[PDB]
Paper text:
The transient receptor potential channel TRPM7 is a master regulator of the organismal balance of divalent cations that plays an essential role in embryonic development, immune responses, cell mobility, proliferation, and differentiation. TRPM7 represents a master regulator of the cellular balance of divalent cations and mediates uptake of Zn2+, Mg2+ and Ca2+, which is required for the normal prenatal development and healthy adulthood. The TRPM7 structure represents a tetramer assembled of four identical subunits, with the overall architecture reminiscent of other TRPM channels. Each TRPM7 subunit consists of an intracellular N-terminal domain (NTD, residues 1–789), transmembrane domain (TMD, 839–1146), and cytosolic C-terminal domain (CTD, 1157–1230).
To confirm that it is VER binding to the vanilloid-like site that causes inhibition of TRPM7-mediated currents, we tested the ability of VER to trigger the closure of the TRPM7-N1098Q channel, structurally characterized as the open channel in the absence of ligands. First, we conducted functional analysis and confirmed that TRPM7-N1098Q retained sensitivity to VER and NS, albeit the potency of both inhibitors was substantially reduced. Similar to the ligand-free apo condition, the purified TRPM7-N1098Q protein subjected to cryo-EM in the presence of 100 μM VER was represented by a single class of particles. This time, however, the corresponding cryo-EM reconstruction yielded a 2.99-Å resolution structure in the closed state, TRPM7-N1098QVER-Closed, where the pore appeared to have a nearly identical size to the pores of TRPM7Closed and TRPM7VER-closed. Importantly, we found VER in TRPM7-N1098QVER-closed bound to the same vanilloid-like sites as in TRPM7VER-closed, strongly supporting the idea that these are the sites that mediate TRPM7 inhibition by VER. Overall, functional characterization of the mutant TRPM7 channels verifies our VER- and NS-bound structures and supports the idea that the vanilloid-like site serves as the primary inhibitory site in TRPM7.
Author numbering:
A (entry chain A): 3 to 540, 614 to 797, 839 to 1147, 1157 to 1230
B (entry chain D): 1099 to 1147, 1157 to 1230
C (entry chain D): 839 to 1006
């Protein structure tokens, strides 16, 4: 059948015949005009009932010959005289002519259909989610008329309550009723076109206009906007989405609302609002001016079980007014003030135009309506009575329906709306259960409702109390939220492929992920021997610092808006933000590498650079208060983050703007100094004091007070615990600035000897200089090995991956390996004893030296970049050599575009040779540098250096070369100039930052380097080696200073927020917004006074007269 | 003239990338020394014996839905980018505050009549 | 994917048709360059025959590229394919090489010294100059890159907008 609609649903229709009102009107012979006009009680014209079996009776007049017990018929049984069959009217309305052509959809079923079928196709076939509210508007359906404010404002709520809860407004469909009125609101608001309210509006197929347009299976409908003035049949209202057109099996008749609009309401209220939550979906009944039947329908919902509440409105019309009217008269519900118990019946008369026996009947309905005034409300637009019908609608389900504040809250949680609960659940004198607050936080966290996290943690829910192993452990094991589907990937990696069926994530696992994401040696609390024990055993089952544990959860499961909220709370704010920048930055890298669908990497890279920018912006807010303590923040051992440091995390995340802040540079200077006060002393004195040891005793050092913010090793702390002469040397030699200027002056004494060897002739055996040269390199190489093995990194494969990601550690490797190819072939050779440079082995080993030298002059840029002016220019020559590879290839086509024709045109007898690989590249390269070879152009000329190259075709090379240089000296070499000139600021700005970042890795390498330079370093090696076989820094604070620093961080965080809030509220754009929104409101509250004042005037013009 | 040719030349490049890719997407597999084979195959057989985005009828609808929504947003966003802008809020604010001046001062009049009234009605 | 459908999907990929022509063209320019530089006897060497083969078969690719073009009337097909810097430069380079091969193969060859038949001389200097059309074409290949493309598409807009300084 291919269509689940008609495969399941069916259409009912009359199959027998029952003449409705047999008596013909006129046209003397009845027989034809009778049958031609006299409809069946079925519905339509009797002749129209095709359904062949009836049509073999329509042939004469009907079924059941003429009279033949004319009384007997008169029921039209809607199962026997009425069989059903598969649907042939179900499709999609297009609303022909609609101004962007708002769409909807329809089906056509039999009212005996069971609600299981309507629900399942609604959520499967029509493919929707179960709502979170059902606003079934059982109001009055007579195209009625209102005042603008209530036409306008009342929608401002009704729409808003339904878009904020994904509702399904369930009207009567028809455009001559309650449907007609919500559409007036649905358009005035427009819902900023989206998946807005998914209105259903069930109605029949009997009273419907242009039924024939939308006949056919799964068929688009040319349904047309007929505002024909009379049109007994009615159009469906415009803005309504999905429709149902239940065909009773009869034109004209009513009834195909309640048979389903009853069942649907209950049947949705039978279903669970959400996976986590376990309530019933709420039903709320709204009333626009009702009627004699509605005012009983109102009562029915009051009388249902579950007691579905109702919302009426003062000033839409007859019923909503009267139900609101008696709500004023009746007090307690049970009363009816007897002084006016038919005086309302005086009003019940005038409004409707009722009679008497129904007047008490309406009044009767009014009584049971009031008997529960509890679960029913009124909308008094004329006053300030719970404004904006939203609150009333949303609230009304909570006040009336007896449910605990838990059962209240959990609904508000499902509806992503605190403002209700903030003022209607979290109200004075409330009976808050002991664990309901806790059990709600379980739901708000998993469902990603930060706003309720805020609400609960405000009203009092300590994360310290609500954070056990089992609670936390499953927060990972949930799909009921914006889950990261990548977390399960990182886990199955660190398990080395293992992947059980369901796999309860254990906290061992999350640890091993963070150990893998944060890298290096970051040991989480989740993996330590203590925690491993207690986890295999289950307030000791709690965590000390919860918001350090949830901040990980909020970031692993990619829940940013939760992460930031959980960041501002708690403590260690700078630290947490830099961990997050590492985690996100670390997940992004794993996403790219291990792809399955959309990377979400730029989503994470944006999430890192958000946290990673708070730290920078939190630092400057601390550097501007007390620059000293703000340098202690970057260095204190954290103790909740694996004994790491607020700066070693930034360096781990390659977060250049932090290490390149002016606090991470004034500290690094303060360590570069050491115990020296080099603002008083001068670099002249250090260079002297090195080559003059006893001049160390005239250098002005720093007190232990001036080295509080400066992390130290254990030994320097001891020399400041346990200045004397002996401690006045140790503080010099173990200074980074001294270890530098004590290596430079060695290296600059290495390059002056090596240079001497390279230039001066070299006999069989190395001269005294060349032995010293080998000594440096050898001992220097050892310094480069021990620099690797004793590196911070863990697995050797990672130690052998950071030290080779450095331009100068490769260039050392190439230069230390190469010099020992050189010393090998220089010392290891036969030495002809007649002339050197007749042993190509000897020759070779030298030319290794004379070329390796370039590695060693170029290294002075590692020394020259120490300066704040020279560093950048050194860090630009990388970014200019890189970003011009493509111009320079274009400059090599042109070179061979010219070199091949010229060597072909000028030397036309050349056998194959390697000279044909130089001479097509040689002179055309030296032309770029202004050497024109002017007496070799026009080789046939009289002034030629090449008078033998004159031959056929050699008059062409002056032209080719003219064309050549115009390209290689005017177009292309001045394209470079324009390249550099326009890429200068944006590389100079960076190269400062790449420099200020690399200053970290440089200083903190001398702060672990031997005192003694690479000719004599071998002593300090043997000392450390000999003793390590026989026998980094820390910011040592006292327990009192740990508090003072802790106080510093707290205040500095609090200001960061308090300043930005004012920088936003003080800005003009924001004051225009408020001013605008006030001045809107002002216009309203003035003009209403302007009205009212105009009533107090026309009053007093007539009261006394 | 470097930025304003570099900005263009990107765009002229990204445009010419169309005519380039969509020429290999109709080019023979086999390069211009051996292409003669793929020619003879196509020639011999064409005497003897562009792309399309093949959707299913279901996907034609889902794409049709995609266009519809994306149009509707384009308008709904720009309308707000205009109504949310400051220049526009100054315009309204201005025009309201003009109107406000009027509807206040007329009350200011009227209130001054309800006062001189009650100073004399009961006396 | 099966083995037989796992080849067809490779070879009929545009990126493959590119890197399978580049490595041919870059094997054409390495032979042509060899011919141009090295002396040239009465008959074409194995290299120079392969050189002619590329151009000839390449020319056919340029004809079928026209006739089977999207455009309608031939006068419009012959107006889009000549609005392209490299399809003109091919036309000039395919027409010119066959003036070169014409005067190189079609000549008397003095049998004592080449470069004493100005016909032979001529046909070569056609080769040694046509070559510039074929190195310059690597900018059609080098402009594939997102960094190199622009710099290739600037050398037009700098050569054009400075004609007037260069007359001064
Ligand atoms: C931090 C990581 C980066 C640094 C890496 C550090 C490691 C560096 C890596 C080095 C690897 C490079 C290769 C080894 C060098 C020699 C190669 C060679 O050609 O030898 C030659 C000499 O061979 C001899 O035996 C005679 C000279 C003594 C050898 C001294 C070299 C080894 C020193 C290494 C000290 C390194 C340890 C430094 C301290 C740690 C062999 O040829 P020949 O005999 O001359 O030929 C005679 C031919 N004829 C007879 C025809 C004339
Ligand atoms: C025919 C002649 C042709 C020209 C010949 C060759 C000449 C040219 C040189 C060639 C040397 C080969 C290295 C090229 C550099 C690659 C890297 C780069 O571009 O920059 C990178 C680093 O860059 C560096 O670390 C070094 C930069 C090159 C300096 C060149 C030496 C200058 C002195 C030589 C004096 C010699 C004088 C004596 C000579 C006897 C930075 O790039 P980036 O954009 O920041 O990318 C991010 C980096 N990241 C991944 C680490 C985050
Ligand atoms: C601009 C203002 C300045 C003036 C303008 C005036 C224009 C008037 C020009 C007139 C040119 C014709 C007259 C010369 C021929 C006489 C014979 C002769 O000398 O032959 C010589 C060949 O030399 C040539 O063929 C010279 C180049 C000819 C082309 C000129 C450029 C085209 C115009 C511009 C367009 C360019 C396109 C630009 C592209 C961007 C041979 O003699 P040889 O050299 O001794 O070598 C033989 C030696 N051997 C026998 C031993 C082997
Ligand atoms: C897509 C559109 C753009 C591409 C356009 C493609 C078409 C290309 C357009 C080409 C037009 C250019 C002119 C024709 C070339 C020859 C001219 C010439 O000088 O010939 C010479 C050789 O003539 C001979 O007959 C001997 C050599 C064989 C001729 C081979 C050339 C034709 C190949 C064409 C293949 C093209 C097919 C390509 C596939 C489509 C005549 O002179 P000579 O005999 O040397 O003189 C002797 C003098 N002596 C005796 C004093 C010494
Ligand atoms: C061995 C070797 C011997 C030969 C060596 C000597 C080689 C000499 C070097 C020559 C340089 C070759 C490079 C220039 C290529 C053309 C540039 C181009 O496409 O411009 C424009 C073409 O504009 C048009 O309107 C199309 C038609 C014009 C074609 C120009 C032909 C030049 C012929 C020269 C004959 C030289 C022959 C000389 C030799 C006999 C760009 O496109 P467009 O403007 O957008 O196009 C119009 C489209 N529109 C209307 C929709 C806008
Ligand atoms: C005395 C010497 C004097 C100088 C001599 C000559 C040197 C100078 C070269 C002269 C060649 C003649 C062509 C000039 C270009 C015309 C078109 C142009 O300007 O740009 C147009 C395209 O441009 C192109 O398509 C090509 C641009 C020229 C590239 C030059 C070759 C560089 C390599 C050669 C290496 C050779 C090395 C070996 C040599 C043996 C673009 O212009 P536009 O503004 O975007 O306009 C819109 C275009 N539209 C209509 C298509 C929409
Ligand atoms: C590895 C790092 C070690 C640390 C470095 C220090 C340890 C190195 C210490 C001493 C090394 C030398 C001791 C051995 C004997 C030397 C003999 C000699 O060469 O004499 C020559 C001088 O010396 C030179 O010309 C070369 C050495 C000095 C200049 C180069 C290094 C200076 C820098 C390093 C120091 C300052 C640092 C400045 C920058 C901060 C003189 O003789 P001549 O030139 O042949 O001519 C004589 C005339 N005659 C030939 C006609 C007779
Ligand atoms: C043995 C007898 C004694 C004499 C020997 C020793 C002579 C002197 C040695 C070297 C010459 C330069 C000396 C200047 C130092 C000034 C101090 C200074 O500020 O240094 C700076 C650079 O520190 C460096 O070390 C820069 C690199 C110099 C050593 C490497 C050789 C490069 C120069 C040769 C290349 C070949 C060129 C060839 C030319 C022919 C560091 O401090 P800053 O940048 O000011 O820091 C700013 C912020 N702060 C101040 C707040 C901290
Ligand atoms: C059209 C597209 C074709 C596709 C390409 C593949 C087909 C082309 C395949 C084969 C062609 C050649 C076969 C015929 C016989 C060759 C003999 C010969 O020249 O031997 C020489 C080598 O060869 C050369 O020097 C020229 C060929 C190789 C280099 C140039 C092309 C390489 C690029 C294309 C390939 C890589 C692609 C690279 C780019 C990605 C050696 O001899 P000699 O130099 O004379 O000296 C010998 C010493 N003696 C003289 C003292 C005795
Ligand atoms: C035979 C054995 C095998 C080896 C032989 C073959 C060796 C290699 C062959 C050529 C050398 C260059 C190789 C680099 C390619 C890297 C990949 C790449 O990204 O390519 C790019 C350019 O693609 C091109 O094709 C660029 C042009 C190269 C071919 C033309 C020769 C130019 C070089 C000669 C000039 C004269 C210099 C002369 C110097 C003496 C395309 O991709 P993309 O730009 O990255 O795209 C960005 C976005 N995306 C990645 C998401 C898609
Ligand atoms: N204080 C301080 C300080 C001391 C020394 C240096 C020198 O730089 C050392 C490191 O600087 C690295 N580096 C460099 N080095 C620049 C450079 C190195 C060598 C030469 Cl010959 C030249 Cl032409 C330039 N450029 C980098 C970049 N663009 N991005 C990331 N890292 C870069 C490089 O790995 C090198 O090992 C920088 C700062
Ligand atoms: N992917 C990809 C890709 C591959 C190749 C190309 C090169 O495209 C070449 C086409 O690009 C055209 N073209 C070009 N070509 C640039 C150029 C061509 C040749 C040379 Cl020697 C040089 Cl100095 C520069 N410039 C154009 C311009 N300024 N306006 C319009 N079209 C231009 C030209 O007609 C030529 O036909 C561009 C992109
Ligand atoms: C894309 C670019 C196009 C241009 C180009 O790069 C790529 O193409 C390359 C091909 C190269 C030639 C290939 C083979 C040989 C044979 C050899 O024969 C030794 C013989 C004897 C010596 O006496 C032994 O004993 C001599 C050198 C030569 C001719 C090469 C020269 C350089 C050339 C022309 C290169 C040129 C720069």
């Amino acid at each position: 059948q291919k269509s689940w609609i008609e495969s399941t649903l069916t259409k009912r229709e009359c199959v027998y015949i029952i003449p409705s009102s047999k008596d013909p009107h006129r046209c003397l012979p009845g027989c034809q005009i009778c049958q031609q006009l006299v409809r069946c009680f079925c519905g339509r014209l009797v002749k129209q009932h095709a359904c062949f079996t009836a049509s073999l009776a329509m042939k004469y007049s009907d079924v059941k010959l003429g009279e033949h017990f004319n009384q007997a018929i008169e029921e039209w049984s809607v199962e026997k005289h009425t069989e059903q069959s598969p649907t042939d009217a179900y499709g999609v309305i297009n609303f022909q002519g609609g101004s962007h052509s708002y769409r909807a959809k329809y089906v056509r079923l039999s009212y005996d259909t069971k609600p299981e079928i309507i629900l399942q196709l609604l959520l499967k076939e029509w493919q929707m989610e179960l709502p979170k509210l059902v606003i079934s508007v059982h109001g009055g359906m007579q195209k009625f008329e209102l005042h603008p404010r209530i036409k306008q404002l009342l929608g401002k709520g009704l729409i808003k309550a339904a878009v904020t809860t994904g509702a399904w407004i369930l009207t009567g469909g028809v455009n001559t009723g309650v449907a007609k009125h919500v559409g007036d609101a649905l358009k005035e608001h427009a819902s900023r076109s989206s998946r807005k309210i998914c209105t259903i509006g069930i109605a029949p197929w009997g009273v419907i206009e242009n039924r024939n347009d939308l006949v056919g299976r799964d068929v688009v409908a040319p349904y047309q906007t007929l505002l024909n003035p009379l049109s007994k049949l009615n159009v469906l209202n415009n803005l309504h989405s999905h429709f149902i057109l239940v065909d009773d099996g009869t034109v004209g008749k009513y009834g195909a609302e309640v048979r389903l609009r009853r069942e649907l309401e209950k049947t949705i209220n039978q279903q669970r609002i959400h996976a986590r939550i376990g309530q019933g979906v709420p039903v709320v009944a709204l009333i626009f001016e009702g009627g004699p039947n509605v005012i009983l329908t109102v009562l029915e919902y009051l009388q249902e079980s579950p007691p579905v509440p109702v919302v009426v409105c003062e000033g839409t019309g007859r019923a909503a007014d009267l139900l609101a009217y008696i709500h004023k008269q009746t007090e307690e519900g049970g009363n009816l003030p007897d002084a006016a118990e038919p005086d309302i019946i005086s009003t019940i008369k005038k409004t409707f135009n009722f009679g008497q026996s129904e007047a008490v009947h309406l009044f009767q309905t009014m009584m049971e309506c009031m008997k529960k005034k509890e679960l029913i409300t009124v909308f008094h637009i004329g006053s300030e009575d719970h404004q904006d019908i939203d609150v009333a609608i949303l609230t009304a389900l909570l006040k009336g329906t007896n449910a605990s504040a838990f059962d209240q809250l959990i609904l508000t949680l499902a509806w992503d709306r605190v403002d209700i609960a903030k003022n209607h659940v979290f109200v004075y004198g409330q009976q808050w259960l002991v664990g309901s607050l806790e059990q709600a936080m379980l739901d708000a966290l998993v469902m990603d409702r930060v706003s309720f996290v805020k609400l609960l943690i405000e009203n009092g829910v300590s994360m310290h109390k609500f954070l056990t192993i089992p609670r936390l452990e499953e927060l990972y094991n949930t799909k009921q939220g914006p889950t990261n589907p990548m977390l399960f990937h990182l886990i199955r990696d660190v398990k080395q492929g293992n992947l059980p069926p369901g796999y309860k994530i254990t906290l061992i696992d999350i640890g091993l992920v963070i150990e893998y994401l944060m890298g290096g040696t970051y040991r989480c609390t989740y993996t330590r021997k203590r925690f491993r024990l207690i986890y295999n055993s289950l307030e000791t089952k709690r965590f000390p610092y919860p918001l350090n544990e949830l901040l990980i959860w909020a970031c692993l499961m990619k829940r940013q808006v939760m992460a930031r909220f959980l960041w501002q709370h708690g403590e260690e704010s700078m630290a947490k933000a830099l961990v997050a920048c590492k985690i996100y930055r670390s997940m992004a890298y794993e996403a790219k590498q291990s792809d399955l669908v959309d990377d979400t990497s730029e989503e994470l890279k944006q999430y890192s650079n958000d946290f990673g920018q708070l730290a920078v912006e939190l630092l400057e807010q601390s550097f501007r208060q007390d620059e000293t303590m703000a340098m202690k923040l970057l260095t204190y051992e954290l103790k909740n983050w694996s004994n790491s440091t607020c700066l070693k995390l930034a360096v781990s995340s390659r977060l250049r703007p932090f290490v390149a802040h002016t606090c991470t540079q004034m500290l690094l200077s303060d360590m570069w100094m050491g115990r020296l006060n080099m603002r008083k002393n001068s670099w002249y004195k250090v260079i002297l004091s090195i080559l003059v040891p006893p001049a160390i005793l005239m250098l002005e050092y720093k007190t232990k007070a001036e080295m509080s913010h400066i992390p130290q090793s254990q030994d320097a702390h001891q020399m400041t615990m346990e200045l004397p002469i002996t401690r006045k040397f140790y503080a010099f030699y173990h200074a980074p600035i001294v270890k530098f200027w004590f290596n430079t002056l060695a290296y600059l004494g290495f390059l002056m000897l090596y240079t001497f060897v390279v230039l001066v002739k070299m006999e069989q055996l190395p001269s005294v200089q060349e032995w010293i040269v080998i000594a440096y390199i050898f001992t220097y190489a050892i310094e480069k090995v021990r620099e690797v093995f004793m590196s911070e990194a863990g697995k050797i494969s990672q130690k052998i991956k950071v030290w080779f990601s450095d331009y100068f550690n490769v260039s050392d490797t190439i230069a230390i390996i190469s010099f020992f190819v050189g010393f090998g072939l220089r010392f290891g050779a036969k030495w002809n004893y007649i002339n050197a440079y007749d042993n190509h082995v000897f020759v070779a080993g030298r030319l290794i030296y004379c070329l390796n030298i370039i590695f060693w002059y170029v290294r002075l840029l590692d020394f020259l970049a120490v300066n704040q002016q020279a560093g950048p220019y050194v860090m630009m020559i990388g970014k200019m050599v890189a970003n011009m590879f493509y111009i320079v290839v274009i400059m090599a086509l042109v070179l061979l575009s010219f070199g091949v024709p010229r060597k072909a045109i000028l030397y036309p007898h050349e056998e194959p040779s390697w000279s044909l690989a130089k001479d097509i590249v040689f002179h055309p390269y030296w032309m770029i540098f202004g050497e024109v070879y002017a007496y070799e152009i026009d080789v046939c000329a009289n002034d030629s250096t090449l008078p033998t190259i004159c031959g056929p075709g050699t008059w062409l090379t002056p032209f080719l070369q003219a064309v050549y240089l115009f390209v290689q000296y005017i177009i292309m070499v001045n394209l470079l100039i324009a390249f550099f000139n326009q890429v200068y600021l944006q590389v100079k700005a960076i190269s400062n930052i790449v420099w200020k970042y690399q200053r970290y890795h440089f200083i903190m390498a001398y702060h672990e380097k031997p005192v003694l330079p690479p000719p004599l370093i071998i002593l300090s090696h043997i000392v450390s080696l000999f003793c390590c076989v026989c026998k980094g820094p820390k910011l040592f604070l006292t327990e009192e200073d740990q508090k003072k620093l802790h106080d510093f961080e707290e205040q500095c965080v609090e200001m960061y927020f308090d300043e930005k809030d004012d920088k936003f509220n003080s800005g003009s754009e924001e004051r225009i917004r408020v001013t605008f929104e006030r001045v809107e409101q002002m216009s309203i509250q003035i003009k209403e006074v302007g009205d009212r004042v105009n009533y107090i005037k026309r009053s007093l013009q007539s009261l006394d007269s």
